[PDB]
């Protein structure tokens, strides 16, 4: 539990076994210290920064997270259908306006689109004040670590099967994890639904990609288990090598494409020029099934996510009131500054709130608000646990917080729901902020959880 | 097979896919240039230097080496038992091994081996000739069967194009068969509480092959193993009053050597002390000192001389098969061991039994003999081929020779032979003037 209290020489032994297991099972990324490692496979590898042993996490809250996956998949789909709400909700960012311009084009064009799909991830923290599972992000596009998360389950299970009796820990409390398998399953099923067995899956990847093995592992599952071919291209390669055939088919680099799996294009930095925007548009207009579509990408935007957490909004996209209960239970309170909602703007207890754009804490929060002569939200107070953190072959102790991402997969064809699944998980673990760490990284370490 | 023809663009793609496959499947080693990579797992990793696509190798000759695997297992076990032949036929390193063996001959108290016979196809004849018999610490059981996987994967993706069929790359179980051999020895020894000690080098950039074997042991066979250097064994190992080997809290029933074959492995008396200790223990050595001595260059030369091989093999068919793969080697019958070599010196080489080799017009040393480098052998002319070589993520073309290494596994109780197997392969490929490979049958 307090892993800091385990004998140092024993910890070295466990760390050595982890570094071994990591290499044998490709828990590896290109080393950012090595020049070509985000471009040339096979060179400059290092194990992922990782937490040695999983931190605890209540089984009741784990289950709540499980339950919510398919309910989130369905919300994301319904919200994406409401073009007017998306357009109306979304003033000043250039990138979001560029995405809205594509969405507006699609609204104009008004093409059928019977087949829709998502590979998404809802991220949660446990909150100490309330003792509640709270959602901190909904990731609707290009979500990573389906392989990484499920290799971490493999690792932690392996370590606990050897060192756990002594430690009083049982590997069967690390939840089972099928994430990467479920990912490729959803892509394979969408490729089948399209029913063009001559087509490949296109994966859209970044120019520099030191997590390329995850994507190759997927393509491998596609090739070997599912018998589907795939190709990888950057948005600019697509602009250069892509076109729409007479029947609407996407063709890239000579190959018919039935599914566009995005592992890029979620960030402004992936669109350095008009080339990348042309590609995004081309692909959206074509008949290929996108994973996901532009309206889905819009749904995970910050402003949309904030909107849904306001009074009665969520309630426009969900009719099952048990689902609305479960959703609202994981939503951190959020408010418009104006009216205040019942004037909890009247704030005396600013330690309990946060202001966010579309952050301001404590006293700065209190001043800002002044009883006025961007939104207000419930402050979250995370759980801490003593971790062992292993990075570039070395280890140290740290007190950390953790954020559990629960993947969802979804696939439908008209009104037929083909997949709507909780699809495994990942965990991101970070040194506290009350210690030498904070928020300012390379992006913590990977982890799992230990139920209850 | 003429891979130099394939256009740069396509090659570049096949290369990309091989580097991907290598990373995903742990065809990886510690990078020489990263100073901690031989000691700390998980850091400074790079794919194995490799040949992109297999070289041709006749099926008939592949089957010959297959058949020879269990014949060589039995030959190794019979020669090892002739203590005085070994002492008699047989340098500081070699004499320290001899010291350990004579000592066990004195003491006079289950046997196993995981070995590998290396061959090359000779152009002069068309023969499969043995070039080495490795009796101790044979590497590349994992690497060899991962290259099998890589090549079958590439020829699945690119085979139809180039007119190659992934099914002409032979099947390969080498690492599984190694772990199986160890697991069975552990069982024979019948101590459910004993571990397997694996003896490792101080710096081991190929540690993942060994880690994979310990992972099979743990997960498939439910056997614990522990890895130690010879000096760690000196410091930590003890023989109990009942003669049993104890190393960090566990009895040791099998000592699997992945070190100890090279003098660099014995920087001090500590390592020499650990080797003796373990040899004198009741643990099963994979292999014993006697096996180690059978693999020496001196014993291998001796065996290849006329009449000698035949003293250690009863079976006439095996004698025939063994002689077929043996390159001629001689002391001094003037007739072959010299008149034939003076005519046709191009077909022969003189080599020290331990100075430069002698060939062509020189080999006129023999006219000199009136009818450094001493023992005459048949010259081998290797069957080269066009290769793509991939190293540190870059590729180039080269013309190469290949050495096919056939692993054998063997185990026995007193007259019962539990295992005597051909057990998969590896291939080492190097410039015409190295890298890991497979073969394409025929």
From TrEMBL, chain B:
GO terms for cellular component: chloroplast. Its cofactor is Mg(2+). Binds 1 Mg(2+) ion per subunit. It is found in: Plastid, Chloroplast. It catalyses: gamma-L-glutamyl-L-cysteine + glycine + ATP = glutathione + ADP + phosphate + H(+). It holds the Pfam family GSH_synthase. Mg(2+) 2 binds at residues 132-133, 295. Mg(2+) 3 binds at residues 132, 134. ATP binds at residues 132, 297, 351-357, 359, 377-380, 430. Signal peptide: none annotated. Substrate binds at residues 116, 210, 403, 428. Transmembrane segments: none annotated. Keywords: ATP-binding, Chloroplast, Glutathione biosynthesis, Ligase, Magnesium, Metal-binding, Nucleotide-binding, Plastid, Transit peptide. Its EC number is 6.3.2.3. It comes from the Eukaryota. Mg(2+) binds at residues 132, 134. Pathway: Sulfur metabolism; glutathione biosynthesis; glutathione from L-cysteine and L-glutamate: step 2/2. InterPro entries: Glutathione_synthase (IPR005615), Glutathione_synthase_a-hlx (IPR014042), Glutathione_synthase_C_euk (IPR014709), Glutathione_synthase_N_euk (IPR014049), GSH-S_sub-bd_sf (IPR037013), GSH_synth_subst-bd (IPR004887), PreATP-grasp_dom_sf (IPR016185). ADP binds at residues 297, 351, 356-357, 377-378, 380, 403, 430. Mg(2+) 1 binds at residues 118, 132. Belongs to the eukaryotic GSH synthase family. This is Glutathione synthetase. The gene is hGS.
